[PDB]
Amino acid sequence: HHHHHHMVHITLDRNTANSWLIISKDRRQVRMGDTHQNVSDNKERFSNYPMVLGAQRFSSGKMYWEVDVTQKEAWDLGVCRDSVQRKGQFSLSPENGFWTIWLWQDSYEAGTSPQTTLHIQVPPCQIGIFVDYEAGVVSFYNITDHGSLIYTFSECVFAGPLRPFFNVGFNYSGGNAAPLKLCPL
Q: Is 159 exposed, middle or buried (0-12, 13-18, 19+ CB in 10 A)?
A: exposed
Give strand ranges (E) for 49-134: 51-53, 62-68, 75-81, 98-104, 107-110, 116-117, 126-132
Length of the chain: 185
User: Nearer Cβ to ligand A1A3W, position 20 or 90?
Assistant: 20
Q: Does 175 bind ligand A1A3W (CB under 6 A)?
A: no
Amino acid identity at 123: P
> How many Å apart are CA 64 and CA 110, to the nearest integer?
18
- Please state the closest distance from residue 47 (CB atom) to ligand A1A3W, in A: 7
Site string for ligand A1A3W, 115-154 (x = CB under 6 A): ----------------------------------------
Q: Does 176 bind ligand A1A3W (CB under 6 A)?
A: no
> How many Å apart are CA 20 and CA 51, to the nearest integer?
10
Q: Does 167 bind ligand A1A3W (CB under 6 A)?
A: no
- Residue list 84-113, contact with ligand A1A3W (CB under 6 A): none
- Please state the closest distance from residue 158 (CB atom) to ligand A1A3W, in A: 27
Contact residues toward ligand A1A3W (CB under 6 A) are 18, 20, 48, 170
